[PDB]
Amino acid sequence: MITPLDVPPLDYFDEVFTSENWMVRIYQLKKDDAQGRTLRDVGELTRSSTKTRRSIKRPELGLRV
Amino acid sequence: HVSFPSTAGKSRVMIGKVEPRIGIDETVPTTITVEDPNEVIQVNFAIESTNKPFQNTLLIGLPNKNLEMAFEPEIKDNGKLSMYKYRIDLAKLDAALLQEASRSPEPIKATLILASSTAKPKENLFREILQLNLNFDVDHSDSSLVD
Amino acid sequence: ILCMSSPGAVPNTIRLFLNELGIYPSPKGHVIRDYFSPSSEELVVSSNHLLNKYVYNARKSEDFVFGESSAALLENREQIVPILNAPRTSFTESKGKCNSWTSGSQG
Secondary structure (H helix, E strand, C coil), X not given: CCCCCCCCCCCCEEEEEECCCXXXXXXXXXXXXXXXXXXXXXXXXXXXXXXXXXXXXXXXXXXXX | CEEEXXXXXXCCCCCCCECCCCCCCCCCCXXXXXXXXXXXXXXXXXXXXXXXXXXXXXXXXXXXXXXXXXXXXXXXXXXXXXXXXXXXXCCCCCHHHHHHHHHCCCCEEEEEECCCCCCCCCCCCEEEEEEECCCCCCCCCCCCCCC | CCCCCECCECCHHHHHHHHHHCEECCCCCCEEECCCXXXXXXXXXXXXXXXXXXXXXXXXXCEEXXXXXXXXXXXXXCCCCCCCCCCCCCEEECCCCCCCCCEHHHC
16 A cells, blocks of 8 residues: 655756556656755755745855865 | 953974964054963963953954854953953864864964944954964864865 | 845845855845954955955055945855855854854955
């Protein structure tokens, strides 16, 4: 048995074809982000849009080279 | 009150040598740098308290390439004596600093700032106090931060 | 796109957009200050802090005037183009007891 909550979403690929009986499935690589973000961040931004809010948090990151 | 600085270098990395050597103008400096030998925590002492602290920071790194890490001191006050502790971890330094100090033979400089708003100008001290000469090998060519 | 900000003007949409790019501006309360300045009244940034020659290369030394500025943190990617810097001594101090957003020349 398979439940719809099992399979996680696919963030780096996007489906472009699948046969009548779902036998052969053809996916395509997504083009890398224009702004330089990791596509997982784009995914989490598009699936979690309204509730994912944080007031203020100083980001922790390495000193700019 | 009068303060006194104590910069302690934990130095998880084995090779390390502090060799203060600088000549600058009169910027309200009055102490003399002294290095005390120890086993692990090899602390350096100074009595360079000539102005009043409202900001008190330790800038470490390469100034000419704009690579500065800022450190905050630990204060302990007993009447007249205001002791400052400057913990410097040689393994918790950011990788972008070590990966550049390994290649470039120039030493990592270390200065301190003890300025204040109400203090009159031309006496707020901004002086160099240490020139750490790192003389070991670090990783490179794999995860360089310059990219 | 051109975009402006200040400790008196921090749009939330602008802050979120820039955070999505990689630039992190300061919040409303935090304001930069520098005690080692020729003019106490406002911020005077020396023309020696220019960091990118193609944007603007100083033919002669000058002093850019800023007032109640707000420095920004930058991530480490290949698209961001730093154009100016803050003086090493300067630091952002907020009204409340919040940690300084940016210390030193990193802002």
